[PDB]
Nucleic acid binder design. Sequence first.
DNA 1: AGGTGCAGCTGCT
DNA 2: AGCAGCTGCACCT
Lengths: 124, 305, 424, 333, 333
Amino acid sequence: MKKIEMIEISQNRQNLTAFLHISEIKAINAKLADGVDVDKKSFDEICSIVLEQYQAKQISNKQASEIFETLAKANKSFKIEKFRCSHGYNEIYKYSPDHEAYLFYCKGGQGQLNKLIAENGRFM
Amino acid sequence: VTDPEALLLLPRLSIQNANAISSPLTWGFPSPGAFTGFVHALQRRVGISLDIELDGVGIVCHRFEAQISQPAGKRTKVFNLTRNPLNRDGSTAAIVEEGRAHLEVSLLLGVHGDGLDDHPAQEIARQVQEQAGAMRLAGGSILPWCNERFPAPNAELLMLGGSDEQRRKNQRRLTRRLLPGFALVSREALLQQHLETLRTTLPEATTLDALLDLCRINFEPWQVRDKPGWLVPIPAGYNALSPLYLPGEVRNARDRETPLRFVENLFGLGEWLSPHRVAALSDLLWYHHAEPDKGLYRWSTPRFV
Amino acid sequence: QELRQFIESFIQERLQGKLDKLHPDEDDKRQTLLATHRREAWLADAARRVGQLQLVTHTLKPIHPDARGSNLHSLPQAPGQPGLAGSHELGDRLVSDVVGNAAALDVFKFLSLQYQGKNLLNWLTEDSAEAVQALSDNAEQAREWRQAFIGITAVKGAPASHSLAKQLYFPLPGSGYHLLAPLFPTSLVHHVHALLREARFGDAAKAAREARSRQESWPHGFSEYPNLAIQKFGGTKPQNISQLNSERYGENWLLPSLPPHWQRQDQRAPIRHSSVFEHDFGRSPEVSRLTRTLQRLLAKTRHNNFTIRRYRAQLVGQICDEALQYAARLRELEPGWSATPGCQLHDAEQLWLDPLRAQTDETFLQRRLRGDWPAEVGNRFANWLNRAVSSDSQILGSPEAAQWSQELSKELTMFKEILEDERD
Amino acid sequence: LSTASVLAFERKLDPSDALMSAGAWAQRDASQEWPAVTVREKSVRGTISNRLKTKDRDPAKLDASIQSPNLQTVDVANLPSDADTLKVRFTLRVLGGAGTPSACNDAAYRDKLLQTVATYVNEQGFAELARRYAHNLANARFLWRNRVGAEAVEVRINHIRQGEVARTWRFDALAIGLRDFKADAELDALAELIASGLSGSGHVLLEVVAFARIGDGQEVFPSQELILDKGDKKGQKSKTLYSVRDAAAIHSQKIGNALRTIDTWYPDEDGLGPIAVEPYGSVTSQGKAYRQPKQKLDFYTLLDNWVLRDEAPAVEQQHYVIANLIRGGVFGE
Amino acid sequence: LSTASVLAFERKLDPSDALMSAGAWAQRDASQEWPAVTVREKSVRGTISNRLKTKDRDPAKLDASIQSPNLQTVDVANLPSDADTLKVRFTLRVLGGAGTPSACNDAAYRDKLLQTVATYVNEQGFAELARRYAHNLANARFLWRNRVGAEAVEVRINHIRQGEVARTWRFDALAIGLRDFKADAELDALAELIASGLSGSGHVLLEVVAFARIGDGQEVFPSQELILDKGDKKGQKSKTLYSVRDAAAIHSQKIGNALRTIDTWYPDEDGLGPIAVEPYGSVTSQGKAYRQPKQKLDFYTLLDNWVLRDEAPAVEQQHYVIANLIRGGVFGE
DNA sequence: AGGTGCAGCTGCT
DNA sequence: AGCAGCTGCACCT
């Protein structure tokens, strides 16, 4: 387990409170530091604390991998992305919340997708 | 630039994939310089051997469609392109844009030569129409005859021979088979007097073509200003911006036996008229004149109204 | 000596702006080299790159991007003939494009800041009193900088053309020919584009539209340009072509020069009781503007009555020709004409604006409409025209309704002679 | 001497846009009033089926991404539900004088090219090239995907001198394959007519009609257009198919590409069969380019060695240079 | 070795749009001049019935929202009141040559891909896939919601060679289920014909008619269209139905989806019904993906191990890859 | 679905 | 024993 997957798994999910059973709360408390504590917390502060501890040369990679594995099992809601690229057929679709589907937007590949993501923002 | 001795019809020329852009400022019908260059090429390839002169052209547009598209309900239009072959390395090439159109027109020509006296008229009309169906007019090829219909064979009207009542009835006869579309004429004097009317603010002439090709509404202190017809901005010749060079001076020239000059477009005004509302049919004809001492190379239609 | 902080601030902004690409493993000499080269010798680097660019108002690249030839900077002399619009009309309003390789274009920014803030835009090369206390250099460096920044306006090329350029032929009066090589009017296009985008959207053009929506419109102007077309130059990278091209975002707009009818729609003159007998008038969708002008055109006073009367006569004369072309292309275009719905009543329009004989041509079919008197159609058309031009005691009691009837009479008097030369 | 700095040739053998109509077999000889096929619209909805990224697969994310489908609106053209065949009609004219350029700078290069083409035509006619050009009219390669899966394709070709038919030809396009070039007793008359029109006298007009028995209510494949899309909330594309006057059609350059499929002399193999005659001969449906300039088998170096240095190539590779002189193009130094 | 960057296939089963008409049972042998089913519109007035977020679920807000009704206009298609059966008719053609791609960059990849498909067809024919394809024409699965609650469904299948009938089949679509694949004596002749078409040794064109007895004046279900503008309260059109020239119809891709409901080999279950063949075989009604890429059973893993590394993925899962190649698409990079 | 300029390399000389 | 070519990389709005 690397880090790029850590910031990916931190940003693509929603922010949820009380998303953990108490067994997983003590399981996570057994795998974190002594001083800091998480209780009645949301997702993003937990990701910020474990990212700050992994930026420090104090928490190991298997331990942060167990933390991010537990956060991967726990969170079940994802953010809907604004743009989606169909890759072999060279098409870019845009999400429309009124149809609950992706409608056709333009022709292009990965460079055009990165361009409209940088112009409009990645998530809804 | 004399009154022509005869008129020559070319009845229904269907052209496929002509050039639509025609100017750095307009995009509609092709420029009339294409039509005058076409009749000069036709003169060079026929009339030297048939002992005649062709100088005039009358553009009657029967119909017109363009390869355009309308994006997203926007108030603009784009051009449908073509797919070019691949590159030498084999990836793709950069795209240059050009517009294509399908038009159907008719062309009446003026003959001044002495070949009319010694040969039958229908032979000259048939040979000109047969030679004209093998070259192109605006960058697009001239389509030939289709089955299951009767084709139109062109005739040679004589203008300088006959009585005046027979003249007027022949000119009313030839206007029967050219009424579906309209004719295109030039309006330099109307643009000049409209510049001189509103000259109390800014005397730039380019702000006059951009004051007749719009919908201006100055409402009450809901009314639309009375358009006197169909005014269109057209290209009206060329204007030099470089001295005349020698036949060997400029490299990559098209021909090394003709002097060369750099050049800008000139923009004028034109109008689309019904063919009934003209006095005679020789008022329509387009001519071109050059002043090589200046840089003025201009085509227009003289002797109209 | 107060012009020494502007160029230093521009160099410092360029040096601090080269930090968005941060690499801590491939910057052993990249960061230090970018900081050291962009400190003092950046003026020499701009002077080395200034030779590629050229100040040009007529570019050759728009025609083709592969073509390499000769671009010209000139303002042509005014023509003698009246009624011609061109790039000669531009006076003080002219702007200059810059042509060359794209990597030199940022150096033009250092040549383009002299017209902003200070007044030494013509003081970079000559008049070095502002080029010494703000240059802060020696004499040889000042001479080299004056030679480098003066080369923007030079000729810079031998007179050449290309095989992908145009080079058309034009005929002389009774002689040979001339070769004409047209170029692209960059500056005229930029001026027309600046005049067009402000009319499309801006301060006063949108405020007058807000006054239009608030239904309280004062005397002011706003324009409307219908069915323009878009032409694109370059592609995804439009800075290769010209500096001016990038400003328009590698684009330019074209005005409609189209013929009177470019969108033909089939004409419904079939056997219909409401589309045959009631179709003796010809209510087309292109007569709404003429009808609206004829409706609100019959109220003017005698203080300006001449132009209004001439406009009404011109509108009627145009409205006759539209009906003539619609009769010539609508029934004459479709190769079929069956029996009308209610042939005892739908036969006037089916006889006048009807085709020739067909497969159902009976004995009294080709000997009825061509042998009878084709002169009732003029009075029938006048009866339709009488509804459009409103008459009452307000006009009939005055002396203007008599001329308004005489104009329609003089127009419909040719309706039997020009509309009666086919059969008879 | 050297190559002219401005060199250009004009397109001979130009077709028109072909038009598509529909009807029934065994009435195809009275197919002048057959109604045209029209372009309609329908809506499609699909799911994720593309090869997704090598580390963003994520078996809980793919389930969340499957619940939002794609949604489009496309143009489509079908045969009617009572019509059996498809008729495709176009016209072709052969223009003649296939050696003279449209633009040339020098006067010595022009006459050297003139005598080179003169020795070619004097040594052998246009008979091989016309025999290869008439194959793509005898079979029906110009209907590209409308030929796959048909059970009967026939082609009627008629020659037009005055406003009447001078001679007629009827072929069976499925017997004549798409791989070899063989000479029949009826294909030689058409080859001689094309070779006589291609030698300079005027122009020769032919009209080509193809009938394909495709099914009953099945879909047909006209050309589709290349546009730069809309970019707003609305429906951006219609996958736009090409039309002339409310009738589905094929472009002129696509039929011109189908007639040009000639050269089997390219040094890769004759396993792909013939390709189209291009300088640095490249295929758009293959992604790459044969006849590279690292070898000496492209158009430019062969013409440079044949005109300037006067070393004639093999008689097979002499046909390729004349082929893309008949094709046309713009070449400059 | 790696996969080519351009690799495309075309579909081998071509159906058309299935149009519908209506009539009476025990006259279905004279059902050639039955009148079509037309689309009408009507007005609906609904109420609120969705979940509330309990932030603005006040006791007065609900009663305020009840007084402002939502008024809409919908499209609807019913049977006539003197008719009780629906008739659905289309045609189908089977092309064959299902291993050769349409476009390919690499020539070293396509030769060994054709080698792999050739050893599959030589090892076992197209008999299993054609059996499962003929089952989905026997039980009338292409009537999606027009099949639930029906009293009796009957299917006629013809074989067309020229404008004649070569063979005829009649089936009871309700006796043959939607769960099992059991071989009859009359279904195996149709399976042999479809395999003969898919192999390449013959031209196969079928026409399929299905009769469904429902009731007098009951509602039928054609294909539904996309409405670009957002649904707008108070009189806006809300749904539209597909049509051809004043007759209701079903899209060709929807009756094509009901033919490739084949695979029971997905690792979740096999007794929960066959689903449609797809990469990462997914049902959008269920919102989940069987054949996840986390296992080794999607199309792009099995294809890239069968060709690049020569690892056969078991006979049961080898029909999945060939069915995906019969389906079509753009694979590769 | 960028054009232009330069550093580097080759290679038989 | 260098000329000519050629490829590939970077810059830029």
